[PDB]
Amino acid sequence: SLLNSRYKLVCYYTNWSWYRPGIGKYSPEDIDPSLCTHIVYGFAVLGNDGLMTAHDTWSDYDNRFYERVVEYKRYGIKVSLALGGWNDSAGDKYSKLVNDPAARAKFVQHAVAFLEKYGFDGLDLDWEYPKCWQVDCSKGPDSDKQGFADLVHELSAVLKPKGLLLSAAVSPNKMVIDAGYDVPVLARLLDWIAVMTYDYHGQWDKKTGHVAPLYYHPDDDTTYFNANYTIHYWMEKGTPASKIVMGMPMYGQSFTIENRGIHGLNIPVSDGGEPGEYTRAKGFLAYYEICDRIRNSGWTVVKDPYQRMGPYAYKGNQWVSFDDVEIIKKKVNFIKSLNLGGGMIWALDLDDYRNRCGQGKHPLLNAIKTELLNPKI
């Protein structure tokens, strides 16, 4: 089993996946406890008073979603609560917090009490990102780095004596890593660092690209927008391999291409792809939306024979890049080869947990688990 293996498999749960129609609805009891060593609940948010608070009281509290996910401790899974996320990182509120020692001190004691009230095993920090707020490095002060490092120390100093876990989800981008993270401090204090080795490319690039390349590709604009560079860079900056879990996407980035006629990488794009009927977000498709388009709507799939990145698929002016089982196995062999702490997925509710595509339930996540448990590298 994963729990008895040397690897973690950190699974993100999202409370908002409840608000999806038909088979896209996901609830706490849809979690498969054989597929995760750790579950991280996304998300709590930073309140206006500088204290962690529930994002969705109707689900988190009134419908006991926190309790229903903390339920999985009964299987030996560690269940943490994540603070932040992309949407909660839009403004200056996390920067204001971390740059204020008195505000940090108030936040830390309340946060630990919050975790203990609901039975969580730890806190996961998901500020995206210190200094580079929503990736814009011009927005925040350099002191976000020291402030975040001190927040991590102050949290660790309270959580660790209580046997509670502290982790962070972190950027894969060299410039954001350089600007936002005191890597030795984080590496020493955090129980794991979930490197978000995805969203390297998307509609914001104005051209097609892969959500999550593993290795450099000769046509890349940079040498650093791939998981191999990112993971080695976290280690070069001072992170032990055992502290790293490598993120893998259960979704794709979608694009509306300017011209039906060319359908390859790095081709001009006019907008995000049309929203999926379940996830309802321009530029984003769950794996179970992508596999259905391939299986039943005739989308054409292009694979990389050198397996530096997963496939992309297209039809008409729609184009999506994503990870299939084949590239997932390659990525997990990469995790094992570097002796990393394990793997991480964003997110449980985006894999084909209903077996809509006939590959079996949870095809991507089961591929990760099987490869992690395979002793050969």
Ligand X SMILES: Nc1c(C(=O)NC[C@@H]2CCCO2)cc2c(=O)n3ccccc3nc2[n+]1Cc1ccco1
Whichever of 75 and 216 has its CB closer to ligand NAG, that residue is 216
Which has the closest alpha carbon to 199: 138, 135, 150?
Answer: 135
Task: Return all residues near 288 (Cβ < 8 A) that are at least 6 apart.
Answer: 23, 24, 278, 350, 351, 352, 353, 354, 356, 357
Q: Is 215 in the site for ligand NAG (CB under 6 A)?
A: yes
Number of H helices and number of E strands within the chain?
A: 11, 15
Distance CA 174, CA 233 (A): 8
Count of C-beta atoms within a 10 Å radius of residue 326: 14
> Which of ligand X, ligand NAG, none does 59 bind, CB closer than 5 to 8 A by kind?
none
Paired sense of beta strands 165-170 and 244-249, if any: unpaired
Structure tokens at 170: 């972190």
Does 128 participate in catalysis according to the annotation? yes
Identity of residue 183: V
Whichever of 228 and 266 has its CB closer to ligand NAG, that residue is 228
Site string for ligand X, 240-279 (x = CB under 6 A): --------------------------------x------x
> Which of ligand X, ligand NAG, none does 346 bind, CB closer than 5 to 8 A by kind?
none
> Which of ligand NAG, ligand X, none does 135 bind, CB closer than 5 to 8 A by kind?
ligand X
Q: Exposure of 292 by Cβ count < 10 A (0-12 exposed, 13-18 middle, 19+ buried)? A: buried
Contact 79, 67 (CB under 8 A): no
Q: Indicate the residue whose CB is closest to ligand X.
A: 86
Minimal distance in Å, beta carbon 182 to ligand NAG?
22
Count of C-beta atoms within a 10 Å radius of residue 1: 10
> Which of ligand NAG, ligand X, none does 203 bind, CB closer than 5 to 8 A by kind?
ligand X
> Which of ligand X, ligand NAG, none does 180 bind, CB closer than 5 to 8 A by kind?
none
Contact 210, 200 (CB under 8 A): yes
Which has the closest alpha carbon to 168: 216, 108, 123, 121?
Answer: 123
Q: What is the footprint of ligand X within residues 221-240 (CB under 6 A)? A: none
Q: What is the footprint of ligand X within residues 127-166 (CB under 6 A)? A: 135
Which has the closest alpha carbon to 190: 181, 199, 180, 179?
Answer: 181
Selecting among 128, 154, 289, 371, the annotated active-site residue is 128
Among 18, 229, 278, 299, binds ligand NAG (CB under 6 A): 229
Q: Is 224 in the site for ligand NAG (CB under 6 A)?
A: no
Minimal distance in Å, beta carbon 372 to ligand NAG?
21
Whichever of 28 and 42 has its CB closer to ligand X, that residue is 42
Q: Is 338 in the site for ligand X (CB under 6 A)?
A: no
Query: Which residues form the catalytic set?
Result: 128
Contact residues toward ligand NAG (CB under 6 A) are 215-216, 228-229, 232
Contact residues toward ligand X (CB under 6 A) are 86, 135, 199, 202-204, 272, 279, 281, 283-284
